[PDB]
Design an enzyme around this catalytic site. Sequence first.
Site, PDB file in Angstrom:
ATOM      1  N   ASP A  53       0.845  -1.316   0.122  1.00  0.00           N
ATOM      2  CA  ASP A  53      -0.217   0.013   0.100  1.00  0.00           C
ATOM      3  C   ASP A  53       0.831   1.250  -0.051  1.00  0.00           C
ATOM      4  O   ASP A  53       0.458   2.268   0.627  1.00  0.00           O
ATOM      5  CB  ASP A  53      -1.014  -0.120   1.383  1.00  0.00           C
ATOM      6  CG  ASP A  53      -2.035   0.926   1.077  1.00  0.00           C
ATOM      7  OD1 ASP A  53      -2.576   1.206  -0.225  1.00  0.00           O
ATOM      8  OD2 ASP A  53      -2.383   1.700   2.090  1.00  0.00           O
ATOM      9  N   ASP A 111       2.348   3.486   7.275  1.00  0.00           N
ATOM     10  CA  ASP A 111       0.914   2.909   7.249  1.00  0.00           C
ATOM     11  C   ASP A 111       1.217   1.236   6.617  1.00  0.00           C
ATOM     12  O   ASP A 111       0.906   0.941   5.323  1.00  0.00           O
ATOM     13  CB  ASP A 111       0.151   3.750   6.220  1.00  0.00           C
ATOM     14  CG  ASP A 111      -1.240   3.493   6.583  1.00  0.00           C
ATOM     15  OD1 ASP A 111      -2.113   4.255   5.734  1.00  0.00           O
ATOM     16  OD2 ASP A 111      -1.489   2.435   7.534  1.00  0.00           O
TER      17      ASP A 111
HETATM   18 MG    MG Z   1      -4.005  -0.173  10.258  1.00  0.00          MG
END
Ligand code: MG
EC number: 2.7.11.1
Length: 254
Positions: free
Chosen positions: A130, A148
């Site tokens: 991601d 993240d």
């Molecule tokens: Mg998370």
Amino acid sequence: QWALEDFEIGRPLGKGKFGNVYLAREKQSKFILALKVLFKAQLEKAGVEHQLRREVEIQSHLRHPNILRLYGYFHDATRVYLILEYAPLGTVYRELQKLSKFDEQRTATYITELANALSYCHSKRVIHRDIKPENLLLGSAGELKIADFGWSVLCGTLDYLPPEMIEGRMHDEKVDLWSLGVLCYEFLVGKPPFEANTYQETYKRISRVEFTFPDFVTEGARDLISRLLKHNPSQRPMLREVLEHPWITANSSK
Ligand SMILES: [Mg+2]
Ligand SMILES: CS(=O)(=O)N(CCN)c1ccc(Nc2ncc3cnn(C4CCCCCC4)c3n2)cn1
């Protein structure tokens, strides 16, 4: 170890749904940090806790200067609070809005910083999956820092995902190399190689690897991107190979 009364909250940073993120300061050390506030409420109601404790497992036990730091955490049975390193120049998303395009120099420089960080990630068997501008942050010296590791190992932007993933198939660390290709393009062009107005149409665009180059796209770039965005994972440049691309060594401000 930590509790809420430990911090003076400050300026809201981002929203997003998970919850919110605040700038804030450790009362007794005067340290500057990013505090992501996540509600237990919507955590189970959308069943993701397994990816959370795992973002922490990875992001706490990980260490590169091109990766954001988690320092730890705590709860109150309404919300979990993550104690985060704070990246003062914000998102690469917002620089991109601010200047619409990037130049070859900045770009390679980001592509480099991102290959090392990914390289250190793949040494340790980890796939981010991601990396996208909204998860790409900037230090005081303006260095790139990946955030993240949520989706780390229908629904949510397809733009950065490679064929094998979008079709639900069997993938490896090679996926991040498609992302980095998409990234590369996105920096030079203003928008992802596979943008669209719908998710089904983006599904197509990605499945058939249909991308083209605006005229101002040098052949050095056309080559790094064509090579990174091959449908077949086998023939995706190694991370070391990327760092060593003629166009990268010429432009990165390493
Ligand atoms: Mg998370
Ligand atoms: C101009 S800006 O968009 O880049 N910005 C101001 C926001 N209105 C901004 C955004 C972020 C930061 N620092 C910072 N430091 C650390 C973290 C850790 N997670 N996050 C998330 C990632 C960005 C998406 C929004 C949610 C916040 C962090 N963010 C500074 N200025």
